[PDB]
Short mmCIF file of C-alpha atoms and ligand atoms in Angstrom, two decimals:
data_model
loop_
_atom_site.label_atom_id
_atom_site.label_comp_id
_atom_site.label_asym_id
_atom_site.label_seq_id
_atom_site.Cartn_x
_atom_site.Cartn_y
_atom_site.Cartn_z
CA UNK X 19 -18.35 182.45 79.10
CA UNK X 20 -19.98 181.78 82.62
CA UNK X 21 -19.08 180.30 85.66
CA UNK X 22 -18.51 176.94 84.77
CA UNK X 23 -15.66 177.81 82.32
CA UNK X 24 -12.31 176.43 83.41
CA UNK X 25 -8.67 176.89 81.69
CA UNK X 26 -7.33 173.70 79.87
CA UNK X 27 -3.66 173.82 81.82
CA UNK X 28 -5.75 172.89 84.85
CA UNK X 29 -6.81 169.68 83.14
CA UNK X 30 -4.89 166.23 82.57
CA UNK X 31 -6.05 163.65 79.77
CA UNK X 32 -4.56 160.28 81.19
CA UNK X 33 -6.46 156.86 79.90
CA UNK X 34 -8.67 156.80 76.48
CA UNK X 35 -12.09 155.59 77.20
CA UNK X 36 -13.57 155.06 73.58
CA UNK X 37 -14.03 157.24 70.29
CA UNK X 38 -17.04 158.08 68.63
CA UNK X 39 -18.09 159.67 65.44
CA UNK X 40 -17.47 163.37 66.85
CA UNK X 41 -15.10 163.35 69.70
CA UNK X 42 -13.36 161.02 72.28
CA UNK X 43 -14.43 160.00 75.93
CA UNK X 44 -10.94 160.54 78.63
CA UNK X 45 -10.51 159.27 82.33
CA UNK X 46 -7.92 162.29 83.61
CA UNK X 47 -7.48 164.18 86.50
CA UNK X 48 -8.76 168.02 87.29
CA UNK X 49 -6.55 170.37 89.43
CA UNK X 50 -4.23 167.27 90.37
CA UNK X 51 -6.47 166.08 92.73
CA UNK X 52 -9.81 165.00 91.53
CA UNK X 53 -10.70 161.66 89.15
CA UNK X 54 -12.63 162.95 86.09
CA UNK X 55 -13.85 162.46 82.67
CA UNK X 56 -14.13 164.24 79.66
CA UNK X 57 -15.94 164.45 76.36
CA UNK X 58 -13.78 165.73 73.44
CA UNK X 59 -15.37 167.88 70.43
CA UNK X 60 -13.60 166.53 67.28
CA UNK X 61 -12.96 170.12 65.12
CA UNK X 62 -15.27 171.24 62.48
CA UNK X 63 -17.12 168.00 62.83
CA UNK X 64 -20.33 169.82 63.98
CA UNK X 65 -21.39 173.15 65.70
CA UNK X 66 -19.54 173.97 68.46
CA UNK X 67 -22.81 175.42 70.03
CA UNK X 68 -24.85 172.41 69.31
CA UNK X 69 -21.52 170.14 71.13
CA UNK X 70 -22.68 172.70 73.94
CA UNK X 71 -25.97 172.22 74.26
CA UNK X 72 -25.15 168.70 76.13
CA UNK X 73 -24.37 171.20 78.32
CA UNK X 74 -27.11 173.26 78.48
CA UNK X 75 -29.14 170.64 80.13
CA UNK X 76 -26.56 169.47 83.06
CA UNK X 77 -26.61 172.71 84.03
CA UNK X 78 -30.22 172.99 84.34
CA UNK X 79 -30.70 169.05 85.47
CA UNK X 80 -28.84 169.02 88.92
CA UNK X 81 -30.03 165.96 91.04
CA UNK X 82 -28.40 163.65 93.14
CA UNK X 83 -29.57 160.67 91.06
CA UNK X 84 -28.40 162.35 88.34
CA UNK X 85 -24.80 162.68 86.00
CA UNK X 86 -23.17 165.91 87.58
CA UNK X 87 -21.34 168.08 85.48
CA UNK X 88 -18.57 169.89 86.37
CA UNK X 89 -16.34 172.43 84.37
CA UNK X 90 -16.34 173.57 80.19
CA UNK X 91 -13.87 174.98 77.83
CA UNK X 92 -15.77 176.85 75.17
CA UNK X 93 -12.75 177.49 73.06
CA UNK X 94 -11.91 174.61 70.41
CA UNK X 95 -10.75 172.70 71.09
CA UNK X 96 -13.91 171.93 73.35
CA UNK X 97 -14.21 170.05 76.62
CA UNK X 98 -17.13 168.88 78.72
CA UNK X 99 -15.89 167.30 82.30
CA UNK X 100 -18.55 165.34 84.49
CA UNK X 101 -17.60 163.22 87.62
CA UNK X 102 -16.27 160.28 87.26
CA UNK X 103 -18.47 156.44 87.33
CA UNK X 104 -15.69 154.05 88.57
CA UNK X 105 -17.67 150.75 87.60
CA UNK X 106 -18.32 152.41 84.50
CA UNK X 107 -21.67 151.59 81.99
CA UNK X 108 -24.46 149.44 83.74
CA UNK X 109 -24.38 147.19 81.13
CA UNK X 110 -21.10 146.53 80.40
CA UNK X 111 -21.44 145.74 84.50
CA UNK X 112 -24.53 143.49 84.44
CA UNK X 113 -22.80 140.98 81.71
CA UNK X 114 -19.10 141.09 83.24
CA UNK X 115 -17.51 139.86 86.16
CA UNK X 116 -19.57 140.97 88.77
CA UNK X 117 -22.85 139.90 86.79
CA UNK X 118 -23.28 136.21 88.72
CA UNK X 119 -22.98 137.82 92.30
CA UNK X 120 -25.80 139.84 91.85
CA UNK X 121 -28.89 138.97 93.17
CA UNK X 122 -33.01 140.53 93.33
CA UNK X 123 -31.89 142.91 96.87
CA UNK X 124 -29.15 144.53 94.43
CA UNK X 125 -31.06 144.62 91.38
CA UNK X 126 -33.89 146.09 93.11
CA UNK X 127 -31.93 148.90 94.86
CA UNK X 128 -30.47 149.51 91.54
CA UNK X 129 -33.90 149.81 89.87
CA UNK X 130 -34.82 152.01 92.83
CA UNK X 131 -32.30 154.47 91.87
CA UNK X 132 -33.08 155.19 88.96
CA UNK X 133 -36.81 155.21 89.38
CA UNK X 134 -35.38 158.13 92.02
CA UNK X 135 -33.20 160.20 89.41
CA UNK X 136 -36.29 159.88 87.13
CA UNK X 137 -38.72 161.23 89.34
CA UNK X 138 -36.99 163.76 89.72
CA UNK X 139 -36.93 164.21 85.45
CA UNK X 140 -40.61 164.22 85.91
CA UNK X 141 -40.92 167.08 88.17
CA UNK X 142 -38.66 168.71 85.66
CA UNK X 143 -41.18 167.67 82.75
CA UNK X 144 -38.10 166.55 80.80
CA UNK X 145 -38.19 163.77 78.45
CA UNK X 146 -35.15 161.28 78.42
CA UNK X 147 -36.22 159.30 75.18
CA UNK X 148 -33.33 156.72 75.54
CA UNK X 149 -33.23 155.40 78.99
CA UNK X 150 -31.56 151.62 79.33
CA UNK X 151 -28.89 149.55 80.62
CA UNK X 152 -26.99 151.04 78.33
CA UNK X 153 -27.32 154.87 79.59
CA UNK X 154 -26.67 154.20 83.09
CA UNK X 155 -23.19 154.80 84.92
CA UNK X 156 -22.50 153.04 88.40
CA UNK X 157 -20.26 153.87 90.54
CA UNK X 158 -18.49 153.09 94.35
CA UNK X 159 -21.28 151.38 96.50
CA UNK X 160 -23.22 150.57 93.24
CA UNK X 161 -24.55 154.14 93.31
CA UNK X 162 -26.44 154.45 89.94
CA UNK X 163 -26.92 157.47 87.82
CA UNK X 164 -29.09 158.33 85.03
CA UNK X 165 -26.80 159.57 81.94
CA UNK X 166 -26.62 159.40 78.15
CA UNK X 167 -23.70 158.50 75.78
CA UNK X 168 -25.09 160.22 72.70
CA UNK X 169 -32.65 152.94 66.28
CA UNK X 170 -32.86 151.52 69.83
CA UNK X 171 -36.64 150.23 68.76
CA UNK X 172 -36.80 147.64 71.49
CA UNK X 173 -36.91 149.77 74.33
CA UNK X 174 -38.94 152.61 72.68
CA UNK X 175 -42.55 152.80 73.38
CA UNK X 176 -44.83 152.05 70.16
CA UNK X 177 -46.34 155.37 70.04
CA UNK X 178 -43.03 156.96 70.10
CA UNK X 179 -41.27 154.44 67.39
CA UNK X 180 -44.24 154.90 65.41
CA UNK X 181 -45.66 158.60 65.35
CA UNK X 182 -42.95 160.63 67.43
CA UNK X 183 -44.77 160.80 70.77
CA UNK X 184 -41.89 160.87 72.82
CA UNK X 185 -43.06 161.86 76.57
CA UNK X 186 -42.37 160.83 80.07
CA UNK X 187 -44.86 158.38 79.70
CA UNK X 188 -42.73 156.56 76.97
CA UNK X 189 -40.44 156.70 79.04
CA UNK X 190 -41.68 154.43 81.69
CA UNK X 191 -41.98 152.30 78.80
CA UNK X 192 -38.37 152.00 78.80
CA UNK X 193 -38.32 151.42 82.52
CA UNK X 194 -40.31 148.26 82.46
CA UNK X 195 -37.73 147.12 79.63
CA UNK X 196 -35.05 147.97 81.68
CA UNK X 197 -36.16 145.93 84.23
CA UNK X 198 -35.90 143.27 82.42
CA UNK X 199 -32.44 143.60 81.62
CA UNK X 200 -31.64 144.09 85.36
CA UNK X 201 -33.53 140.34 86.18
CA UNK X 202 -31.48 138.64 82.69
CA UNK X 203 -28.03 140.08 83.70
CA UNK X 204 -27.52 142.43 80.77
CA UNK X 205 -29.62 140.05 78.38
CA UNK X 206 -31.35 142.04 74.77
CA UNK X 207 -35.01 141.67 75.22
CA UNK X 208 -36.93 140.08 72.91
CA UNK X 209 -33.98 137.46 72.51
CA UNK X 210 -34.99 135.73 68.94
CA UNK X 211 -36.61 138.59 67.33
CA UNK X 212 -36.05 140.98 64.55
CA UNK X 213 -36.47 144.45 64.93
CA UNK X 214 -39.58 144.15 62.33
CA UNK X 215 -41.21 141.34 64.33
CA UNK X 216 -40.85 143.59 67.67
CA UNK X 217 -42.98 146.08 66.25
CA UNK X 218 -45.61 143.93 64.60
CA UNK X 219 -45.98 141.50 67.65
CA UNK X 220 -45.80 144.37 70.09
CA UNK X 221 -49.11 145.97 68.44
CA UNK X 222 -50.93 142.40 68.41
CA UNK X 223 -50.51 142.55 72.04
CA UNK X 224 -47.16 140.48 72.54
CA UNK X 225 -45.44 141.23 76.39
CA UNK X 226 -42.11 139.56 77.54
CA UNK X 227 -42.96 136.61 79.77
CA UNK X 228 -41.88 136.95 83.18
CA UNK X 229 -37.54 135.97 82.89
CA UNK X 230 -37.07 132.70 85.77
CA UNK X 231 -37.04 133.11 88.77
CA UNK X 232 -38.38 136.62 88.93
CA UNK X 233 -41.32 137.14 91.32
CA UNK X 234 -44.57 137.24 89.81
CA UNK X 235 -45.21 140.85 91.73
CA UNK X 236 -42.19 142.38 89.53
CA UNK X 237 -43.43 140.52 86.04
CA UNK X 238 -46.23 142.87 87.20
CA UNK X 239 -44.68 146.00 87.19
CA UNK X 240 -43.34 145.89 83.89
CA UNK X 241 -46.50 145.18 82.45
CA UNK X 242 -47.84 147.84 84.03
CA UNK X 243 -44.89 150.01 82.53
CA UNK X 244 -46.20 148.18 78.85
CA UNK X 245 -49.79 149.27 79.14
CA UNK X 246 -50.95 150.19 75.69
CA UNK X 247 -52.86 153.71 76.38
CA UNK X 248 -49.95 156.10 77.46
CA UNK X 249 -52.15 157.77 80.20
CA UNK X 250 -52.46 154.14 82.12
CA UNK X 251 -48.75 153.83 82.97
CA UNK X 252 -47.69 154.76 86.17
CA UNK X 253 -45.79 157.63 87.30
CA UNK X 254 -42.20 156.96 88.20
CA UNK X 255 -42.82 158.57 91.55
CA UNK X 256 -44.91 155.60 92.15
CA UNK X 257 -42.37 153.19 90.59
CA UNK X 258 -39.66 155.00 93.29
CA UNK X 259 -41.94 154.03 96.48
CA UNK X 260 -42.70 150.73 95.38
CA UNK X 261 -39.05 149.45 94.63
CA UNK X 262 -38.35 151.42 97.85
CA UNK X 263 -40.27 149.20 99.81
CA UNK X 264 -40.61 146.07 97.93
CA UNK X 265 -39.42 143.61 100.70
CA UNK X 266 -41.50 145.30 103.38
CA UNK X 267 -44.28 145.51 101.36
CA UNK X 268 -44.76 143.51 98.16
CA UNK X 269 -42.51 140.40 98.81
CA UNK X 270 -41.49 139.82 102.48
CA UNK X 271 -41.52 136.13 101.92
CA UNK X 272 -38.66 136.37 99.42
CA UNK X 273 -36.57 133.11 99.07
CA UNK X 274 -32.71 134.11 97.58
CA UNK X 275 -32.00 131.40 94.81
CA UNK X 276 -29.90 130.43 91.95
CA UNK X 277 -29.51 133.53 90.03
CA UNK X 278 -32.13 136.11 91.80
C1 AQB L 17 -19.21 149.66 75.69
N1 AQB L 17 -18.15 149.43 76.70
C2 AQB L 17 -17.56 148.09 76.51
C3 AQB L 17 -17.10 150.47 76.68
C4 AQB L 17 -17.49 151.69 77.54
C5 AQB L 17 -16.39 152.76 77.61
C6 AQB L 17 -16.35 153.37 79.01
O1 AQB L 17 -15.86 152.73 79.94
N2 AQB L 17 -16.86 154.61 79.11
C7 AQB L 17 -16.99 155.31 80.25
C8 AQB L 17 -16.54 154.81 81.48
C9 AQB L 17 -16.70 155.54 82.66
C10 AQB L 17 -17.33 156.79 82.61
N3 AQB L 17 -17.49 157.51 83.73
C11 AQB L 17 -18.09 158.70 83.69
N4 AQB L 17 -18.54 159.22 82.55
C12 AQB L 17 -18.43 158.55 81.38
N5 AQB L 17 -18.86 159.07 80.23
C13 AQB L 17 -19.89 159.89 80.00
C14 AQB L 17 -20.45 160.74 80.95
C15 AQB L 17 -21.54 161.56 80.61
C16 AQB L 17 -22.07 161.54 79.31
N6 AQB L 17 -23.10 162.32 78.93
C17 AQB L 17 -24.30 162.47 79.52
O2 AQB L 17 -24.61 161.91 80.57
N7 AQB L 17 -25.11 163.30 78.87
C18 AQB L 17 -26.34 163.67 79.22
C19 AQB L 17 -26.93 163.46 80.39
C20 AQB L 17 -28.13 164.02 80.25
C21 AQB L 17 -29.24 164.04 81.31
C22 AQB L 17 -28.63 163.74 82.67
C23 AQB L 17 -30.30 163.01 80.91
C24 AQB L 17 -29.91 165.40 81.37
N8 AQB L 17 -28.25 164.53 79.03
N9 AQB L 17 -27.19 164.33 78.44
C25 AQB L 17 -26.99 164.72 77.17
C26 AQB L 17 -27.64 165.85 76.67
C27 AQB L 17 -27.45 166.23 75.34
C28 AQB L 17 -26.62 165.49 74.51
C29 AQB L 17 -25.97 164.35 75.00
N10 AQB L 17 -25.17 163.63 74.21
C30 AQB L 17 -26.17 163.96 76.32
C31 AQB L 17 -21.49 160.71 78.37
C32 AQB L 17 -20.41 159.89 78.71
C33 AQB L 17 -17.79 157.30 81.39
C34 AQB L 17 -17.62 156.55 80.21
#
């Protein structure tokens, strides 16, 4: 036990969040004063010090940009509590209510974000392996921050899919798909395509075309996130900078329209 441990009396499991195959996800309260959320361990459904190991790494991965964790219980039943995302899952955000209202400024600053919180995975020379839509939580402000709920072929990089290079490098990979699902409101990439044809266009040299109304300068981007030799994709301190200042410097005739 360490620092981080906390007694279950000073915890409060309110709202149910979703179940999955070895615990459930809580909204609840910590001390009686402070929104949280919590990961349940579902008893003798796997190793209590593998459940842990989630752990492990949001102790060592502390970043603004990033999921912060907050307290354990280490006796079962087990706990993990992290902050909690108000507007919940990016995606579920992108294709909902407040999809429409969004426009490029918002997307971009999104995008920007997360560039941010990986850069900062970089430094760390962790790799993610399953960064998307799908992985991010938002929260007040539209503060975005890179998490993971615990195959997603589509957004994996072919020399990953295919012979288990999974590196930083694949993960910009991801990125670039990402960004497409920012620009199509929550959209599957590839719309039309089986997750055999994916893989067998992909290698033939297949790209996405750039989705309407997207700048030509961000269609770009991603395809320099899709670059076939691993080495030629850029580092996502670069992608940071350049999202940073994309209307100062890459588009500072931009035109607000229909949908972007
Ligand atoms: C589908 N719709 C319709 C319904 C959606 C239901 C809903 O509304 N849910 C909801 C709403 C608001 C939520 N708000 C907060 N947290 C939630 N949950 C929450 C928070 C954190 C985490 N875990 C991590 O982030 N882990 C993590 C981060 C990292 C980094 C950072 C990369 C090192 N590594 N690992 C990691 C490492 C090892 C193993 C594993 N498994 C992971 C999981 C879930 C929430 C959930």
């Amino acid at each position: 036990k360490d620092a981080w441990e906390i007694p279950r009396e000073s915890l409060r499991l309110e709202v149910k969040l979703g179940q999955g195959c070895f615990g459930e996800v809580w909204m609840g309260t910590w001390n009686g004063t402070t929104r949280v959320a919590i990961k349940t361990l579902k008893p003798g459904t796997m190793s209590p010090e593998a459940f842990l190991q989630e752990a492990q790494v949001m102790k060592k991965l502390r970043h603004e940009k990033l999921v912060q964790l907050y307290a354990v219980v280490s006796e079962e039943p087990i706990y993990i509590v992290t902050e909690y995302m108000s507007k919940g899952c990016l995606l579920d955000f992108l294709k909902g209510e407040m999809g429409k209202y969004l426009r490029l400024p918002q997307l971009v600053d999104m995008a920007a974000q997360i560039a941010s919180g990986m850069a900062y995975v970089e430094r760390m020379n962790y790799v993610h392996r399953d960064l998307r839509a799908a992985n991010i939580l938002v929260g007040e402000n539209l503060v975005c921050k890179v998490a993971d709920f615990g195959f997603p072929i589509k957004w994996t990089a072919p020399e990953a899919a295919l012979y288990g290079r999974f590196t930083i490098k694949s993960d910009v990979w991801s990125f670039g798909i990402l960004l497409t699902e920012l620009t199509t409101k929550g959209r599957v990439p590839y719309p039309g395509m089986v997750n055999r044809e994916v893989l067998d266009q992909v290698e033939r040299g297949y790209r996405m075309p750039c989705p309407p109304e997207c700048p030509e300068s961000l269609h770009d981007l991603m395809c320099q996130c899709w670059r076939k030799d691993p080495e030629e994709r850029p580092t996502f301190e670069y992608l940071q900078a350049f999202l940073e200042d994309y209307f100062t410097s890459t588009e500072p005739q931009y035109q607000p329209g229909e949908n972007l």
